[PDB]
Structure 1
């Protein structure tokens, strides 16, 4: 196609241990949602991880609600949306 791409194959072949977590992070950024619902025939690890994801979402939503309810400045919607997302994600 003519575009420039780095030699990812040689980098994996020389330093595969780092690229394991690099690929795992890249997969975790782009994860499709589960089409079928969770049921009683699923793995115990599966329900634990589902509960962990739901608890993470609920913690983020609760902290978002608390920071929005405090109304620190009482004041560009995307600006304080991104800033509040940052303060929740590092709080």
Structure 2
């Protein structure tokens, strides 16, 4: 194509222990939603991980809702939501 690409193969071959975690981060960033639903025939690890994901979503939503309920300066909607998600995911 003509675009410039780093030698990912050589970098993986030299420092593979780091690139395992890098690939896991990249995969977790772009993970499709499951078409199947959780049933009683699923693994215990799968339902534990599903409950952990639902818990993470619920604490994120609860912290965002509490901070919005505070209204700590009573004031740009999109910049407000950006700073809001920034403070919520940090706390």
TM range (shorter): over 0.9
- Count of residues paired in the alignment: 91
CA displacement at 1:76 relative to structure 2: 1.1
CA displacement at 1:54 relative to structure 2: 0.1
- Secondary structure of 1:26's counterpart equals helix
Q: What are the ranges of 5 or more consecutive residues in structure 1 without an aligned counterpart?
A: none
- With normalisation by structure 2, the TM-score equals 0.99
Quote the Cα distance in structure 2 between the aligned partners of 1:7 and 1:73: 49
- Secondary structure of 1:73's counterpart equals coil
Q: What are the ranges of 5 or more consecutive residues in structure 2 without an aligned counterpart?
A: none
- With normalisation by structure 1, the TM-score equals 0.99
RMSD: 0.3
CA displacement at 1:63 relative to structure 2: 0.2
Structure 1 moving runs of 4+ over 3 Å: none
Quote the Cα distance in structure 2 between the aligned partners of 1:89 and 1:80: 14
